[PDB]
Amino acid sequence: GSMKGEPKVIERLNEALFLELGAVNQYWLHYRLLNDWGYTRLAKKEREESIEEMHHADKLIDRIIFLEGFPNLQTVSPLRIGQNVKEVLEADLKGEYDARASYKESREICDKLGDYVSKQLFDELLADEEGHIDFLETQLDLLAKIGGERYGQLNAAPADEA
Amino acid sequence: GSMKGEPKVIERLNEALFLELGAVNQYWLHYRLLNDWGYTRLAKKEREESIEEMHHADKLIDRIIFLEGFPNLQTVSPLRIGQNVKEVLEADLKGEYDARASYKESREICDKLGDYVSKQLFDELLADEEGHIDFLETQLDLLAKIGGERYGQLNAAPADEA
Amino acid sequence: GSMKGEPKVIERLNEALFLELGAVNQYWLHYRLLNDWGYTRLAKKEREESIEEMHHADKLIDRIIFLEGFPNLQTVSPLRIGQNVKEVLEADLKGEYDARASYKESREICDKLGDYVSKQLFDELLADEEGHIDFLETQLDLLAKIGGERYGQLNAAPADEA
Amino acid sequence: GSMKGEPKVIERLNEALFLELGAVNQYWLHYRLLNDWGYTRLAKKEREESIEEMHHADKLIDRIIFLEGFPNLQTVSPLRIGQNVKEVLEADLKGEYDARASYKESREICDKLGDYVSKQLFDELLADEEGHIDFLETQLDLLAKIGGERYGQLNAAPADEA
Amino acid sequence: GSMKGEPKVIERLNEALFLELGAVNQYWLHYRLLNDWGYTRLAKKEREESIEEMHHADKLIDRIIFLEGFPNLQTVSPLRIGQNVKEVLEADLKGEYDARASYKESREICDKLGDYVSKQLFDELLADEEGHIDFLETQLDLLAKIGGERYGQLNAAPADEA
Amino acid sequence: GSMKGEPKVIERLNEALFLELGAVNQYWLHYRLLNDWGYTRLAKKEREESIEEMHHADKLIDRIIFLEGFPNLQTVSPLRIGQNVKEVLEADLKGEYDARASYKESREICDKLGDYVSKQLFDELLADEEGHIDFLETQLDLLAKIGGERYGQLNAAPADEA
Amino acid sequence: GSMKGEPKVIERLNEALFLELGAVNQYWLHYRLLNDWGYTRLAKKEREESIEEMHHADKLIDRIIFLEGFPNLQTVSPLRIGQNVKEVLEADLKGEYDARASYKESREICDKLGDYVSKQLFDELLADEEGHIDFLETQLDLLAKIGGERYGQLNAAPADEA
């Protein structure tokens, strides 16, 4: 018996890790920019989401090592950095769709190759990303309906607690 | 002695139940839509009002069974589903006026037929619906005065607590 | 990228919602009847199960809206209303088998169409319904073995706590 | 201005008091008999119901004195005393129907004569009696369905807590 | 649908408000006079009753606004100000009878015009006023039986707690 | 509707139970041997793992009964009993690989036959066994790197707490 | 007045960030490898040090944004990944010396250009890195003196708490 994973499974896991490290760093930078712009409420959520992506990355790393593969943390996927509140949300949403599409294909490859526990891991990440797509599309819907300046005000703190 | 109710009283009670199940379901769907649109504060109130209508439905069911009638939960009254915040409030208000008018006529029929305890039940529901008409007309007054986009912002949560 | 679901997936979700609203209402009416008949212990469980079905309905509604579909709360599936304790259990069991069969087919359609998160939702509901089929078949087994009158007594409260 | 009530209103109030003192005493004796027969659970409920009828009697006495009438506590309405559990419930039910019919007629006379606060008092007692008719008819339904001996066992305590 | 009340209903509500503001002010002045005269116990009750009348006034104001009428707080009904303890009680009693008679007629007009929730409000105020007529007639009965000077002493505090 | 499972599904469930009872007993005996040899820390973990396998066996038994099959607890799979610390870990690892391979094939058969809830149960056990394979391969890696005598010392308690 | 930093200062800050993201990822992977190898005590320290490097990265990001520069999180410095405990410590030490040398040069450039607050930030990071060089050189000294296998045993947990 051996836990040596399928090379294609470890590749999909590393591709997920590539995207996850990009998302961690994009959310963390969006956090710092949003805070510097005054949108301290959205910034706090952005930092929470960076941390959620760190947990995803950690689960992927752990699974690759268990499959006796080598996790690649040397590179991170292309960042999309926004220059105003709406661009930040739109950039996050595009990265979420990239993750969604990647994990859907990955769960299918793991299933086809008989690695059902890795398949399960991609199924859990897929559900998590769809939840965050929910959130981001809701925020962009709200921003369109009440307008960007009111959306920014709603997500800014007053000066005595900024 | 017999608790067998007047057929016309059980009919009025079932007509109230018909409307009440419609209101439960309309408020619950309005809850889920409002939340998905970002108006998490109005959504929470909408869900509270759905639950209040469930309690009305439950009292009606209990009274019909006590009168040895058969409660009908198979059908629900026509739903009015809004597509923006103002339409949601307007749709709820129309259903409240339907309930108000139905319960006013029902208290009169129960009184005429000598079922004063059923009459009392319609009197309590009538007062409750008028309270909710108060609330909805106040919210629509506020929305007209400060404008729909500011009313939406007021009833939305920031992103770190949405 | 788009969260617009497959029309056939939203149809299966709405078909589940149709059945779920029927189950909510059947369990709630069975609750009120059982209580009126004196079987206050079985009534309390029936009301708990109605609430469990409300949570199922709520998850389905939320998923349909996320897929940008329109949840239908206007109609509810045909109710089976029992006229004694055993008929109540038998009627609930038939509705559970309807839900089981519907969700099994739905998980297969979602899987075939590539909506694995909706598939997951049907998988969780399927497990939940099978648990309730377990319970109902156990209760009907007990009722057959100790007899209906002893089963009724076991599930009735004494008069000072009824 | 004068609080001197209508003679016919005080008569209806005294007629209610007549019935209420009969119900107090019938429930209290049924309590002591049921306990002596071993049905300690039903006995405890019977004693609770005697006390509920004492509160009704007290409200009637207070209202008669406020109307400057003279409450009659010299006589009590005919008691119906059962000789087994089912007869006790049937006897209580007959007295409840007597009270119900009396209070319905009394609320109508008070209303016709313009004493709306006395009318209200009869409306509250009417609702209370209908609740107790609910309870008694439920218990008699249960007794018929599981049988009198099982109903007695259900409402008896074991010997170490009788 | 419209909550625009019947003009005659708003008139009755405003007539009640007229009397209620008079009662508030009469009880508050009677409070201050009684205290200045040394009857600190009766004064405290008088101030409590002023506050109870404020709550009545507030309910009336709220109902008029809900009916889309305009509450009139510009005028207050004629005050009856006593110059000794017995005159204070007699003056309060006369105002209570005025309120009682006004609310009885008002509940009848609201009922006739189909505004059963306003009718209910007058029914609740009517019961409340009859309770206070009870109290005042009891106090005047006591004052006649033990004599005015003993009644005054009973309702005065000693000098170290006056 | 019927919960009568596929005969091949109950066979796979019973095959899992066969292996699980073997693992329970192998871990429990390894516990007692390790303790007797002085390796009280590894012994405590071994006993914890026996109990984890008991929970697996219990879930399988429950599922077989729900499918109206008959759980077989008469036989247990071949035990591999080690005679030193490294052999104990190697023997546990071989049994874990047997369980892993059995559950992977079983999830595939349940899926093919349309029993997705039984499939889910094998998916959860599969993930659990892979976690324990992780642990055992890590311990064997550590034992090779620091040497068996140091690994034994690390997993022994001092004499005043052995 | 303007907070627009010197381009060369932002370059040094971004060069520090480049190294810091490499250190975060190297420590996090070393954490997961060490844990998988059984050295759970050293793994926990490695994860703590990854987090310390995250705080350094965060301070650098914040300072770059304050200087109106653009933080680069797209690339990370070359990782040195060890394949046994001693190589892990040696690889961490080499990265620490790279950071030390980079921050020493950076504090000198910031000082020369008159950005004393950025200079201060490099001075604080420099002190922090020298503390971690202290730790790593101490651990490598200990490993040489007691031997690698005893150093590994010392930094491994027993099986009941691994």
Ligand code: NA
């Ligand atoms: Na993620």
Ligand code: NA
């Ligand atoms: Na605003």
Ligand code: NA
């Ligand atoms: Na209602």
Ligand code: NA
């Ligand atoms: Na009337």
Ligand code: NA
């Ligand atoms: Na369900």
Ligand code: NA
């Ligand atoms: Na599949």
Ligand code: NA
């Ligand atoms: Na009574």
Ligand code: NA
């Ligand atoms: Na008043």
Ligand code: NA
């Ligand atoms: Na197992």
Ligand code: NA
């Ligand atoms: Na650092």
